[PDB]
Design an enzyme around this catalytic site. Structure first.
Site, short mmCIF file in Angstrom:
data_model
loop_
_atom_site.label_atom_id
_atom_site.label_comp_id
_atom_site.label_asym_id
_atom_site.label_seq_id
_atom_site.Cartn_x
_atom_site.Cartn_y
_atom_site.Cartn_z
N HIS A 62 40.26 52.75 37.71
CA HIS A 62 39.69 51.48 37.15
C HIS A 62 38.74 51.79 35.98
CE1 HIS A 62 41.17 49.89 40.94
NE2 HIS A 62 40.31 50.61 41.61
N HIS A 92 29.11 53.86 34.90
CA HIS A 92 30.44 53.76 34.38
C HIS A 92 30.44 52.78 33.22
CE1 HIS A 92 29.99 50.42 37.15
NE2 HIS A 92 30.73 49.81 36.24
N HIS A 94 32.90 49.72 30.88
CA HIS A 94 34.06 48.87 30.67
C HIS A 94 34.33 48.80 29.20
CE1 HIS A 94 33.52 47.24 34.82
NE2 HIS A 94 32.30 47.62 34.54
N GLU A 104 31.76 43.00 29.32
CA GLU A 104 31.83 42.04 30.41
C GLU A 104 30.90 40.87 30.15
OE1 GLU A 104 31.77 44.36 34.20
OE2 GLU A 104 33.96 43.95 33.98
N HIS A 117 27.23 50.38 32.64
CA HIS A 117 26.58 49.90 33.85
C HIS A 117 26.02 51.08 34.59
CE1 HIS A 117 29.32 46.11 33.85
NE2 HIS A 117 28.29 46.04 33.03
N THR A 196 31.16 43.24 39.42
CA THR A 196 32.20 42.70 38.55
C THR A 196 33.57 43.18 38.86
OG1 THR A 196 32.09 44.35 36.81
CG2 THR A 196 30.58 42.46 36.67
C1 LIG Z 1 29.76 50.32 42.01
C2 LIG Z 1 30.36 49.08 41.58
C3 LIG Z 1 31.35 48.43 42.26
C4 LIG Z 1 31.81 47.28 41.67
N1 LIG Z 1 31.32 46.76 40.54
C5 LIG Z 1 30.33 47.49 40.03
S1 LIG Z 1 29.64 46.78 38.53
N2 LIG Z 1 30.90 46.76 37.51
O1 LIG Z 1 29.28 45.38 38.86
O2 LIG Z 1 28.64 47.70 37.97
N3 LIG Z 1 29.80 48.64 40.47
ZN LIG Z 2 30.72 47.83 35.86
#
Ligand SMILES: Cc1ccnc(S(N)(=O)=O)n1
Ligand SMILES: [Zn+2]
Ligand code: NA
Length: 258
Positions: A62, A92, A94, A104, A117, A196
């Site tokens: 992902h 990570h 996006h 996002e 993030h 998200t």
């Molecule tokens: C660890 C994790 C899971 C899902 N979503 C996120 S996020 N994209 O909201 O940072 N982080």
């Molecule tokens: Zn994220």
């Protein structure tokens, strides 16, 4: 579960396995800069990453996660809208297929090329899996990326991506300093939201910095050479792994700055 970002399994489908997808505090959202109110009550933001211990980088199919040692209070986020102490567990990104999309969160409907993030969990809940079951369990620091000059503190990341091209590949990733990914200013917007990606849990205090960082076209081009697929499978480039803006509903976005 077989969620992703394609036509057949993308954000419009997620609700069928994760009904909270249509909940009251989903993320991301559009930040309307003319509706967000300066909040003088917000304490200052404290990003304490001096003792951060990065361990590994993982392509999870992902995005890719840079993982940290969160067995003690090594790298924490405190202050701002937060009560107590939030431990860094991973970061990570996006990103998009082209520079005109990828983030996002949006800012007056503007989409950035990407979004970082930094995920932290509330230490009063003891572990991450307990924290995500709480409305104040996580704090995610979000940072926009725009394409311009190269970000030197990112280059170590982009240079390892060749080694984790496909889903399930990981690499050793010690001694990486996430301070190198911050902009100059810590001015921010904040609102209550969710993860998200599935499971989409409504456990996040979002802190989104106003100032984007600049990364080079060459750097973001290398993100887009990653794969969603596993080794040996037909190539599906890891691009456009972002969820679009969700309904604000009964929420207020606060600004730390006038
Ligand atoms: C660890 C994790 C899971 C899902 N979503 C996120 S996020 N994209 O909201 O940072 N982080
Ligand atoms: Zn994220
Ligand atoms: Na960990």
């Amino acid at each position: 579960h077989h969620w992703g970002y394609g036509k057949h399994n993308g954000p419009e489908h997620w609700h069928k396995d994760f009904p909270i997808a249509k909940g009251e505090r989903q993320s991301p959202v559009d930040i309307d800069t003319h509706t967000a109110k300066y909040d003088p009550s917000l304490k200052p933001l404290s990003v304490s990453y001096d003792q951060a211990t990065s361990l590994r980088i993982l392509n999870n199919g992902h995005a890719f996660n840079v993982e940290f040692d969160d067995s003690q209070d090594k790298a924490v986020l405190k202050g701002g809208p937060l009560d107590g102490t939030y431990r860094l567990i991973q970061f990570h990104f996006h990103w998009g297929s082209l520079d005109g999309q990828g983030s996002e969160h949006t800012v007056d409907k503007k989409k950035y090329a990407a979004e970082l993030h930094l995920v932290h969990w509330n230490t009063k809940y003891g572990d991450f899996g307990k924290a995500v079951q709480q409305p104040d369990g996580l704090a995610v620091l979000g940072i926009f990326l725009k394409v311009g000059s190269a970000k030197p503190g990112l280059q170590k990341v982009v240079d390892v991506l060749d080694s984790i091209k496909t889903k399930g590949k990981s690499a050793d990733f010690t001694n990486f300093d996430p301070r190198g990914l911050l902009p100059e200013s810590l001015d921010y917007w904040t609102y209550p939201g969710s993860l998200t990606t599935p499971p989409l849990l409504e456990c996040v205090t979002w802190i989104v910095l106003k100032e984007p960082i600049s990364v080079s076209s060459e750097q973001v081009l290398k993100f887009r050479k990653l794969n969603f697929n596993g080794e040996g499978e037909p190539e599906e480039l890891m691009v456009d792994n972002w969820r679009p803006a969700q309904p604000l509903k009964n929420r207020q976005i606060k600004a730390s700055f006038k």
